[PDB]
Symmetry: C3
Subunit: 320 residues, 3 copies
């Protein structure tokens, strides 16, 4: 595996082996720093441009404390403070960022903006969430699952919710780890047809199952991991009611868990609202939500180290 | 004294000996770094979450440059950038902060928010000012006074102004250093009845006097330190006039100082407006305002070091 | 040359020799860090207050990554977050910044605010752009030109655009390097009469030519460097049309270059709009725009090191 200098816009560009390497490095960095208490200045004398177009708590903190914990300087940049709209062409900000920072993490709306940024910048561009994908979230999720189950292959993931960026990222990666996917979305709220097609292909290549359905309980049946995220989230758009009406019945409850495998667990990328999951499941001993949120930090540290240095993990490779 | 792992929401939870330790450590860090020019990476490999709900110049700068000066990474977080209102439950942001940062300094409105944050987070929560208390301000104030007078015991503090967070913090701490307090507030603008009751108790336990009055000159009589803060500060609320009418006569002038002890000095937490104090007192050689503002930095550094490390002061304990 | 402790509000206060020293140090820091890959913690245990009243991409990034790359902590401060308007007197924020940071870079509107800040603060105040000057931009520009041409003396600079802060900074410095200046501005959009008078004086003292004109092609004739910046920039003020009407004919095109010296190159401080220069010149192999933007970083690093440390350049002095 050779990842230095690459961008990380989506997991579709990464093989099973490459994503497994990032989880190995995550585990290595976590063992060395969190458990052995070592100081590892691997990104010393480096900087990161962190462009944020939307609010963030987890991606913000994990990237900022993580970049800094390796001795590098993270630079928090917003639309309000820098030139980015009608203020300056993205080609120009991409070249300017290239000569001043060593990499960019950018949370945008348009995935097309990440593509322009990656084409125009000569430094690594990491996706901090876009409307289409959220790869660095799935990195934390899969690490949290490997830590819980001691392996990944053969697990069935049960998505219940909107056919959004988190589901597309799972779709781009689950089969590469030999994990099955059963996903429930309302009619008209399906995953992107292009992504589904590629997920079907990955499932065939890896001998895993892919199931798309509109029934929450069908998605949950025999699943080891129940996964959801905010659906209602129309923000605050008066006419909404329909993201409530179409999504009625998608709340993850213990009824949902009753249908799942005996060793079931629960994930949610956060922030969480009451509509997608109730308090009984969200704060269940089986809920891996806050371990998951913590692993956003060790995995973005591993992303940064693999895309910018030639560091080799000292840890034994985790069983996947 | 054992302070590692504790929160610092208010000085009422701290004994005279514990607050004296923080001022000793402040003095130690200041002597070592400001005077001997040493580099002390005591908070290396640590991060701080700095949640700010209101504007700040002194708390912002002192905490940020101070955390960084000890080799740690401070992370400036606002309501605008992270999920914090109706955006995410505070219990969840508190647990997320716990796995990503080593401590949190939070400037909030509600003291109840600091309490939730302290109960839910497994990392130290430091008060960056709330409506009810501002403990880290009084730390700087008392250090500035010890440096001026070479001791603290027996000094009489003269508050003139609103019965606010600064006065409550003095009330929670002055008697523990064996200092007397005389405080003037307008009728209806008295300190919190709960705080006053506990201040009366501390005065009795330490053999000091507590005097509450509505007369500025009564508060100032025989006082070694004249202390005030912005009262008018209705922000900009049209109907106000009353915080001007009720507070008319509360401006600290040389008339006020004429009634004070011969060795009188003046404090103001800042920012300062013309209404609470005139330019003659504010820029008097007896005004300790800018030394006080500087000591916000050495004292928040000592707070952070005592709540996160096992560092022992090398300096001789200051005379209190 | 002795620059430690000085402010840098404008290049008019600096001799040819002093500005040459900053470009030597810039080149030294760039060779050592960018080319030899050295880590130089020259600003370790120092902090910078970066006050920004307006948007910034280049000044923000270059100052922040550059201060940090030398081991110091940059602190990004805005009008929204700190007390600065009617919130606190500038004299007081200047003294508070003096006891908490080691230097201040401030992007303001009024040059008078930088003057108050420099008079009241006991720490170095660096101009991050004001309405009247932008000295640290011209530092990068001249370094980029020295790198391109291998010297500076005798080059003719051709300004076409508004009589703004960039032109005033060139006016304050070009002749001190023995470079001629030909500047075109519309009628009524001339450089400040006070600045022009001092530029005329510098030209006489150094034996260089100064030409002010309203004709773009007259400014461009025989010029080695074509320089422009955003003129239209009325922001978004409806009545504008006149900054378009008065400035019609000021777009730098290959017609402009045809009249220039054979070895011509192009500069633009950025951000760039389509009106001041077309895409053919802006993205020409002769366009030094993005090297120029990169040199904002090495030059602000040299400013900071010369105003705060006693570091001597190890590099051979560049030929100017």
């Amino acid at each position: 595996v050779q990842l230095k200098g690459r961008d990380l816009l989506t997991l579709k560009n990464f093989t099973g082996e490459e994503i497994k390497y990032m989880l190995w490095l995550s585990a290595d960095l976590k063992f060395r720093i969190k458990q052995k208490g070592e100081y590892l200045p691997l990104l010393q004398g480096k900087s990161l441009g962190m462009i944020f177009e939307k609010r963030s708590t987890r991606t913000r903190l994990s990237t900022e404390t993580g970049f800094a914990l390796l001795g590098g300087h993270p630079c928090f940049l917003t639309t309000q403070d820098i030139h980015l709209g009608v203020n300056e062409s993205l080609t120009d900000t991409a070249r300017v960022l290239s000569s001043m920072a060593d990499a960019v993490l950018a949370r945008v709306y348009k995935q097309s903006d990440l593509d322009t940024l990656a084409k125009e910048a000569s430094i690594p561009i990491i996706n901090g969430l876009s409307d289409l994908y959220h790869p660095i979230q799935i990195l934390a999720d899969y690490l949290t699952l490997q830590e819980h189950y001691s392996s990944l292959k053969g697990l069935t993931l049960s998505w219940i919710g909107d056919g959004n960026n988190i589901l597309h990222s799972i779709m781009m990666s689950a089969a590469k780890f030999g994990m099955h996917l059963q996903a429930a979305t309302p009619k008209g709220y399906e995953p992107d047809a292009s992504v589904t097609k590629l997920a079907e292909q990955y499932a065939k290549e890896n001998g895993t199952k892919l199931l798309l359905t509109n029934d929450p309980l069908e998605a949950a049946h025999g699943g080891n991991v129940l996964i959801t995220d905010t659906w209602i989230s129309m923000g605050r758009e008066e006419e909404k009611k329909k993201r409530l009406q179409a999504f009625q019945g998608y709340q993850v409850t213990m009824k949902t868990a009753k249908v799942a495998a005996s060793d079931w667990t629960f994930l949610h990328c956060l922030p969480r609202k009451p509509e997608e999951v109730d308090d009984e499941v969200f704060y269940s001993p089986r809920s891996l939500v806050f371990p998951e949120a913590e692993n956003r930090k060790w995995t973005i540290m591993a992303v940064m180290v693999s895309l910018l240095t030639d560091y080799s993990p000292q840890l034994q490779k985790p069983k996947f």
